[PDB]
Amino acid sequence: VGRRALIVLAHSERTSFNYAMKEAAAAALKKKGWEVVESDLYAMNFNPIISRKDITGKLKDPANFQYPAESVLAYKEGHLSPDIVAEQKKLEAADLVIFQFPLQWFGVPAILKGWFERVFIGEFAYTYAAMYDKGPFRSKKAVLSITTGGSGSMYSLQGIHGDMNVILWPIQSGILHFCGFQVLEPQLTYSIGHTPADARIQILEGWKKRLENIWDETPLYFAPSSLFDLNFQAGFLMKKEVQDEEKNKKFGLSVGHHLGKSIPTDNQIKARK
Amino acid sequence: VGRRALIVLAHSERTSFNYAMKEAAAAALKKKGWEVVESDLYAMNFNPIISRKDITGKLKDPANFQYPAESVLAYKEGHLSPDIVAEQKKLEAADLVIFQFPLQWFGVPAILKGWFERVFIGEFAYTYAAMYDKGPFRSKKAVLSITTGGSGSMYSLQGIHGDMNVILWPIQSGILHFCGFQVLEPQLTYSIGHTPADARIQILEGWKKRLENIWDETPLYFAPSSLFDLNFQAGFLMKKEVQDEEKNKKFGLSVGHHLGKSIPTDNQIKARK
Ligand SMILES: Cc1cc2nc3c(=O)[nH]c(=O)nc-3n(C[C@H](O)[C@H](O)[C@H](O)COP(=O)(O)OP(=O)(O)OC[C@H]3O[C@@H](n4cnc5c(N)ncnc54)[C@H](O)[C@@H]3O)c2cc1C
Numbered sequence: 001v002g003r004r005a006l007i008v009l010a011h012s013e014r015t016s017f018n019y020a021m022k023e024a025a026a027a028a029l030k031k032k033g034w035e036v037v038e039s040d041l042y043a044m045n046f047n048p049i050i051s052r053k054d055i056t057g058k059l060k061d062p063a064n065f066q067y068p069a070e071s072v073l074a075y076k077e078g079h080l081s082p083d084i085v086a087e088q089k090k091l092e093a094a095d096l097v098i099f100q101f102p103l104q105w106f107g108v109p110a111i112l113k114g115w116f117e118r119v120f121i122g123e124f125a126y127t128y129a130a131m132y133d134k135g136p137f138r139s140k141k142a143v144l145s146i147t148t149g150g151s152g153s154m155y156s157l158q159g160i161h162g163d164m165n166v167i168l169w170p171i172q173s174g175i176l177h178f179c180g181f182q183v184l185e186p187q188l189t190y191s192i193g194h195t196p197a198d199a200r201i202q203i204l205e206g207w208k209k210r211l212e213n214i215w216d217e218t219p220l221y222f223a224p225s226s227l228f229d230l231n232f233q234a235g236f237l238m239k240k241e242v243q244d245e246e247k248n249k250k251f252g253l254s255v256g257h258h259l260g261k262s263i264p265t266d267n268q269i270k271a272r273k
Numbered sequence: 274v275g276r277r278a279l280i281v282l283a284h285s286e287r288t289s290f291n292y293a294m295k296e297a298a299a300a301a302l303k304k305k306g307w308e309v310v311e312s313d314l315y316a317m318n319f320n321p322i323i324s325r326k327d328i329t330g331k332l333k334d335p336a337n338f339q340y341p342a343e344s345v346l347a348y349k350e351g352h353l354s355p356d357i358v359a360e361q362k363k364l365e366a367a368d369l370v371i372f373q374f375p376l377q378w379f380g381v382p383a384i385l386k387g388w389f390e391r392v393f394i395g396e397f398a399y400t401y402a403a404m405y406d407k408g409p410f411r412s413k414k415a416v417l418s419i420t421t422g423g424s425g426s427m428y429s430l431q432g433i434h435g436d437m438n439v440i441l442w443p444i445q446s447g448i449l450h451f452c453g454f455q456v457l458e459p460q461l462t463y464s465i466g467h468t469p470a471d472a473r474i475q476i477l478e479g480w481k482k483r484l485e486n487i488w489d490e491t492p493l494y495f496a497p498s499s500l501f502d503l504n505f506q507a508g509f510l511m512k513k514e515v516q517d518e519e520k521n522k523k524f525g526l527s528v529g530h531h532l533g534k535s536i537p538t539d540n541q542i543k544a545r546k
């Protein structure tokens with residue numbers, strides 16, 4: 001159990017179900033003796049774009065600009081934009097991280113996809129040496145909590161919207177696990193434009209119950225980077241003895257590591273593997 | 274063949290490979306007698322956030338705000354924000370649509386993920402009746418062209434980054450096909466931070482070759498919405514006779530329609546199915 005957390009609301013409104021879920025998250029963690037940092041994004045009319053004005057001091061190369069390179073430099077010295085630096089020390093503090101938001105266009109709203117870019121800078125958040133489960137934030141846990149337009153049958157394995165494990169891999173593995181996070185199961189509060197008034201409290205209640213023993217959960221299964229060739233000459237492929245083990249096995253490992261086989265369904269939604 | 278197009282650069286720089294790819298796209302289409310609209314996003318320091326100030330006139334409900342509902346209303350009358358309306362008539366004009374950008378955090382940069390939200394409004398872009406291949410933009414074609422941090426072996430089926438078909442479903446199906454677009458194959462220009470100076474011309478050349486007979490291509494396979502239960506009582510599931518046809522078949526249909534089976538690999542990258 002850890003003494004700290006971070007919540008990130010990503011909806012304009014303070015009337016929304018997302019706000020209520022955040023205030024429900026707040027009151028829940030506050031009730032267990034956790035510190036609850038809040039990066040209410042829309043409230044702090046946050047910057048979502050990457051111009052060259054993230055870096056404070058002189059540009060090392062102001063002719064052609066690799067933002068990748070010029071950002072990494074700016075961190076280690078200590079002259080980035082301090083609205084990035086402010087948000088960074090919350091993460092160094094916070095053991096848990098909760099992202100509350102709506103699914104609009106099969107992904108996270110624009111204002112969080114700018115948060116991810118500007119804050120998660122190389123060395124700080126990710127390295128191309130310290131990757132995935134070896135990554136900086138490996139001693140942390142992270143959770144998603146989404147508010148969907150369609151129903152839960154639409155995003156089934158055979159709904160028109162297709163699988164939901166598929167829409168969570170880009171995020172839960174590609175961002176959170178890539179930095180280090182032991183990604184816990186997400187909270188899929190579907191079709192909220194239909195739900196009754198009382199069932200928009202049952203959801204808010206089941207959330208608070210869940211948040212009690214949240215650190216003591218077991219996270220989702222991602223093929224650990226102990227199973228891979230971490231050098232860029234072989235091609236960063238999966239280790240060659242482990243390839244033969246899975247050719248007698250029926251499923252994949254993750255969604256992205258389907259291996260052209262069965263997807264162990266609810267890989268990104270349930271944890272028991 | 275159509276007499277129009279639209280390109281959307283989503284990188285700050287005009288030195289970038291993305292800019293060169295856009296200028297290469299521009300000169301290519303201009304050479305074939307196509308009109309080339311350009312929404313150079315960073316140049317038009319574009320708005321990526323959704324506040325309530327997209328709608329011009331009075332808010333129908335300024336107590337609790339569904340942006341979904343208040344946006345749809347605002348379109349059909351004709352008093353949205355005109356920087357949205359300006360971008361919209363380009364789409365009504367443009368037959369083809371090219372998205373040039375970098376893959377940062379397993380997806381599209383923040384400034385395009387705001388473009389998608391504010392411009393693709395209900396009735397205009399998508400409907401919950403006219404869905405997918407029946408959708409508004411069904412008489413149009415759309416393409417992606419990406420610039421990646423890692424190499425092409427990393428995003429193989431057994432690389433640490435996992436599949437690339439998996440990272441393209443959220444976008445190519447969940448955005449473009451959902452509106453209508455017959456999504457043509459994407460342009461995966463990998464690891465550009467390593468590439469030699471001359472091979473950063475071979476790529477720019479092969480692009481221009483490809484753009485000549487681009488409309489005469491055959492698009493990617495997405496399970497058409499003729500195969501689905503388009504009413505929200507059964508649950509928007511796949512039609513019940515078609516379910517039995519695929520239980521004797523070995524592969525899935527799409528990535529999201531894996532059906533817990535093999536993924537017909539390069540579903541989102543090659544077209545022959
Ligand atoms: C916060 C952050 C997170 C990231 N996360 C990931 C991740 O999770 N996974 C991942 O794989 N990558 C990641 N990346 C890396 C990202 O993919 C790279 O930024 C991008 O792929 C590299 O292209 P670029 O547009 O940034 O570079 P460019 O600015 O396009 O550099 C390309 C070079 O080609 C030159 N060039 C070639 N031809 C021409 C021409 N005709 N005219 C002019 N110049 C030319 C340019 O001058 C330049 O030097 C991340 C980057 C950042 C900043």
Ligand SMILES: Cc1cccc(C(=O)Nc2ccc(NC(=O)c3ccc([N+](=O)[O-])o3)cc2)c1
Pocket residue numbers: 011013015016017018102103104105106147148149150192193337338339341
């Ligand atoms: C009752 C109430 C009040 C205020 C606020 C709220 C709320 O959070 N609404 C809400 C409900 C749903 C979404 N997501 C979508 O609408 C949506 C758009 C496009 C897609 N898509 O194509 O997958 O899904 C966003 C906000 C609900």
